[PDB]
User: What shape does this take?
Amino acid sequence: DTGLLSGSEERVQVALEELQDLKGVWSELSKVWEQIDQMKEQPWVSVQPRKLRQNLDALLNQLKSFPARLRQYASYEFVQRLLKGYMKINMLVIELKSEALKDRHWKQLMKRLHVNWVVSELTLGQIWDVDLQKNEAIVKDVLLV
Amino acid sequence: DTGLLSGSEERVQVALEELQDLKGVWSELSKVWEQIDQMKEQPWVSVQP
Assistant: This one.
């Protein structure tokens, strides 16, 4: 018998508590990503921006649902910046719904983003994976012209 | 004694069974026309014939 390492015990305790915290975080983040992937999978060519704004508000409510313990994490800040870029996606949506969306317009935008697309399925998850925050200049030039 | 016409309550219970059957029928029809609502309000963005 000897003085047991209480450092190991407190390490186990903090590991367990942070593990449960991050498990709740992973549940919330899995819900967030599945919903955003589901909505961005559709072309949303003839779908008003307001039904994506309401999803934005729902994401905000989900981000405010968990206590402040996650709100101090890098994942919370990343999801908040994702929400900011998601209202940027709303900013984009007007171009998606715009009368601008022509075949030659599609080809010029495609050349700007260098990706390859199939017209039948306009899965805008791909157009957002090509980050609009990253390629803002080229898409803005296309929108202006 | 008050010998009552039990046929009235037999009709009551028959109507009750018919009502439960109709409730099931209209629950299924609610699902049917709900599904109709989903493909029906569709602005024709993604759906194929």
Notes: The interface with chain B takes residues 42-47, 121 of chain A (CB under 8 Å).
